[PDB]
Amino acid sequence: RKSKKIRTSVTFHRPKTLKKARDPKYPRVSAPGRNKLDQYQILKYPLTTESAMKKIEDNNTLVFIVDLKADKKKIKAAVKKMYDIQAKKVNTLIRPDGKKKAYVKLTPDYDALDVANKIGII
Amino acid sequence: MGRVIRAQRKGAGSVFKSHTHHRKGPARFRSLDFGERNGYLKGVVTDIIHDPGRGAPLAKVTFRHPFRYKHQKELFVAAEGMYTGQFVYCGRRATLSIGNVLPIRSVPEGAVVCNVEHHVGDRGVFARASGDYAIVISHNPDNGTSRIKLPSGAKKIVPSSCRAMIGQVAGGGRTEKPMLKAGNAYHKYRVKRNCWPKVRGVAMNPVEHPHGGGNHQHIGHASTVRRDAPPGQKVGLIAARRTGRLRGQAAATAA
Amino acid sequence: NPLFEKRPKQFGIGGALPPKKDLHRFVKWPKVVRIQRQRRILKQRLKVPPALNQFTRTLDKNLATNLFKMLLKYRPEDKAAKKERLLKRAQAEAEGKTVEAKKPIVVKYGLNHVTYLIEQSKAQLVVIAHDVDPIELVVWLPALCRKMEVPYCIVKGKARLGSIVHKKTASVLCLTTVKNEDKLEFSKILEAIKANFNDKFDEVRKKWGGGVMGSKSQAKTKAREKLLAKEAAQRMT
Amino acid sequence: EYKRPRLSRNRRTVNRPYGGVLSGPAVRERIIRAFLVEEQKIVKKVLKIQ
RNA sequence: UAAGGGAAGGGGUAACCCCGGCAGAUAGCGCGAUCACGCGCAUCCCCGAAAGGGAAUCGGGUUAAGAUUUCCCGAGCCGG
RNA sequence: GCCUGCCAACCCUGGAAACGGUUCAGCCGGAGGUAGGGUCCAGUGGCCGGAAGAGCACACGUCGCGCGGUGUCCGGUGCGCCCCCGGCGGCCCAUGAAAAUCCGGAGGACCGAGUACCGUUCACGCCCGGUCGUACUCAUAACCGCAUCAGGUCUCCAAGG
RNA sequence: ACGUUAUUUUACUUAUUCCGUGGGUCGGAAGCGGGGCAUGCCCCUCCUUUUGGCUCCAAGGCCCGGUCUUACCGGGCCGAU
């Protein structure tokens, strides 16, 4: 493509400036090793305490103890998969245990009390 | 022997260094394209900005013209009588008015200048401290050499291509009238690179300083030490031609 | 004019970007460009030994090109060509039962090979590259040929010789033998070197270094002109 | 507050040229300068050539 | 982002380690741009004040407690 | 939301001597004042929206983990106190940062249509907003001095005589 | 004669050295102005120039134009030696 005169002429009307050129890259074909699906269950169990119990009634919210690599996005998806409910917020607390306590605010359209019964929590 | 003395501490380190960053910017002179018969590089004084780093002003001259590779802007050294909105001309064929900078050859003999270049493009070497000025002593039709009598009084051979600015530098008289406080002295030295109080060599311990020690106050030995003397040794009045109070003069070369 | 209003305008200089100018001669170089340009210039500046600067006095373009036309016949094999030949020979000798091919005639090439041929006096003519990055390597080649009284020629372009062999640097290639048909025009080539060096060994710089420097040439003209004017005016009046 | 927000287009500007930039009596000073230079320039040019 | 610190470069120092950038300057980052191609540019690039500087919230209620902050009503406000 | 600020600043009128207004530095007006009429910065207050559906004080009720009702308003004063915010003035051989963040204007290429195309820095409507800390003490007892040590240890609120 | 060899002085651009930059408009010639010199035939052996001038604006799209391949589309060259 490039007929050498063109590059020379561009620099000719310039006082230096910078550079510019480009060149390609290629991915291999040999299949880098290790195929895996090591995956933790973010929801472990609904955490059960006196302070958990009151909140279910009061504010439509189950309280779980969850992994130490928790966020809000993954856990909301997980709650939807496993208990068929929409979660409106997830709230994150470090514990002196060294794991993360999750307060998960649930939908009013299917009440946390009647979610609770099949994965009982006090 | 002794612990190391205070001069050697310059070295590097923030503690001995000044706040050079606070200082307001470059003092540089924009390197002429060519030409300059009145206003081919036209500057406009828009401010005269104080420089804390020498406590005397540099005129803010703003060159603004475009292209892309155009190089412009910033602080040429202030001269007397300059005003805002007056145009500044920088280059070879520039008109002879105060505050304009041009090669020394085109400036006539006997003419007061401020700034000179000690080889082209080093931007200002001779006379920059306030109320001082060089006066260009000789030229003739000499391609090689312009001779300038400096504020030191020395007559210097320097190339005729070297730029100088017409006028004397501004802020004169600065040093002449007395501080009349220790506290006024402190503030000036704080802003520049100097540590303020001078402890005398006598007042220091014999370990720290050669002149220290002794029951009564005195410098123990002759103050004058050799120029050839090495670092550490070299103290007092170094290589003094004479001492005691009479009848010297300025630097007086002859040709 | 209905088409446009202002037919002339001055951009150019005193406003607008100027004519492009010679920025091929100015611009910030990479390091490699800096060193390569200097090397030829410095050849002049330092005194150049007797073995060198016999070089640079190279064979003519017309002579060089017709030399290559002879070599068109003799060209050495490619990687593919050699491999191909083995298959042809193997088939012919085994199945046909035919006696071996005619003796091959080609240029012989490579430093150690060719230099041995000069010693034995097998090589009729050797063609020597002007270039080659270790200059120590190639000073020996005309020197040895001259000593043994075997004719040689120095042609520009190490790459140009190399193209014929279909490789990289040949450095030298030579003809130990030539066909009877090529023999007549081969005589012209032998004459060619002793038609630019039918001379005794010019051992270039006596002490001389320099070659003329652009600034110095201008300075010299001015100095000469002033002197000439003065001298002429004394005689005249 | 002063960037892409509850505010409408007008509140960032004055309609005149150099609306936010120059004061208005300052703007006219540069219109005067623009006028003076162009008229003077033709007079200068014809004088020099002759 | 600052004072300042510190990879990257060149160079000493075996080396640890230290200055600190260089041929990121016709080595590529950035924008149109979906279309593959063109156009533009440095002193880079991160950390550095949980005090500098700053995208955006209030009220009431509650428990063992700070609540603009937890909770909740009602009303917003900012960014995508 | 509607309305509203004087200093500073600006517009228009007008043409001033018996010259004026005016600062803690002489500064407004002689490149147009004093004076008359406007305009702007919107700290702030007002009234309305928020928002009483709240909260506060009462009465009554146990009708209880709580029931029904009211009233909750209108002025005044300044060398007060604290803090803020405004525009000034003193200081200096001292003249008192930078960036993210970021709009503006100048620039006018390019793209502009009608039964649609262009605005989409506007209003209204729809969805979403991740990561980590939040206990509480903060000291004559939760900190540091072996320590429930008369010590020390950064900051905000600051009643009445 | 070929230089050879040794002291010092002195000079050039290539080592090295210093400094200038988001390496800019360098140098040499000639275009075009025009002057001074004996200004004579221009006057070379020279000196100023070579698109910008009061006038807190502004100089960005290598530009409009001219010109050529090229139906328009679109590309050169020149404008700006």
Q: Which residues contact A88 (CB under 8 A, 6 or more apart)?
A: A105, A106, A107
Length of chain B as a residue count: 255
Tokens 């800096």 belong to which residue?
A: C34
Resolution value (Å, 1 decimal): 5.5
The distance in angstroms from the start CA to the end CA of chain B is: 48
Chain C interface disruption, residue of B36, B67, B70, B143, most C CBs within 10 A: B67
Q: Could you please report the per-residue DSSP string of D10-24?
A: GGG--SSTTTTTS-S
Longest alpha-carbon distance in chain D? 63
Backbone φ and ψ for A121, nearest 5 degrees, come out as -150, 135
Q: Could you please report the per-residue DSSP string of B9-42?
A: G-SS-TTTS--TTTS----------S--SSSSSE
Q: How far is A69 from chain C (nearest CA, A)?
A: 50
Q: Are B153 and B252 in contact (CB under 8 A)?
A: yes
Residue B165's SS3 state is: strand
Q: What whole-number distance in Å separates Cα of residue B204 and Cα of residue B232?
A: 16
CA nearest to B102, candidates B116, B87, B81: B116
Interchain CB distance below 8 Å, C17 and B67: yes
Q: What whole-number distance in Å separates Cα of residue B104 and Cα of residue B158?
A: 10
Q: Are C140 and C128 in contact (CB under 8 A)?
A: no
Residue B67's SS3 state is: coil
Q: What whole-number distance in Å separates Cα of residue A4 and Cα of residue A16?
A: 18
Method: cryo-EM
Long-range contacts (CB closer than 8 Å, 24 or more residues apart) made by B178-182:
none
| Residue A120 to residues A59, A89, A108, A116, Cα–Cα distance (Å) | 17, 21, 19, 5
Q: Is B86 exposed, middle or buried (0-12, 13-18, 19+ CB in 10 A)?
A: middle
B7 DSSP assignment? G
- B27-62 core/surface letters (b: 16 or more CB in 10 A; e: else): bebbebeeebeeebbebebeebeebebbebbbbbbe
Q: Which helix (H) or strand (E) holds A65?
A: strand A61-66
> Within its chain, how far is the Cα of B1 from the centroid?
38
A90 touches strand F (CB under 7 A): yes
Q: Which residues contact B102 (CB under 8 A, 6 or more apart)?
A: B36, B89, B90, B91, B92, B93, B94, B96, B163, B164, B166
Query: Which segments of chain B are extended strands (E)?
Result: 42-51, 56-62, 76-77, 87-89, 101-103, 111-114, 134-138, 146-149, 155-158, 163-166
CA nearest to B70, candidates C12, C25, C15, A18: C15
Interchain CB distance below 8 Å, B40 and C17: no
| Residue B4 to residues B201, B226, B227, B231, Cα–Cα distance (Å) | 13, 20, 20, 11
Helices (H), chain B: 182-191
Q: Which of C21, C22, C28 sits opposite A16 (nearest CB)?
A: C28
B8 DSSP assignment? G
Query: With the C-alpha atoms ordered C76, C77, C79, C83, is the resulting torsion angle positive or negative?
Result: negative
Residue A34 has which token pair?
């290790």
Residue A17 CA, nucleotide G62 C1', distance (Å): 15
Residue B142's SS3 state is: coil
Cβ atoms within 10 A of the Cβ of C200, count? Answer: 6
Residue A92 has which token pair?
């994150």
Half-sphere exposure of A77 (CA within 13 A, CB side): 7
B105 DSSP assignment? G
- B200-219 core/surface letters (b: 16 or more CB in 10 A; e: else): ebeebeeebbbbbeeeeeee
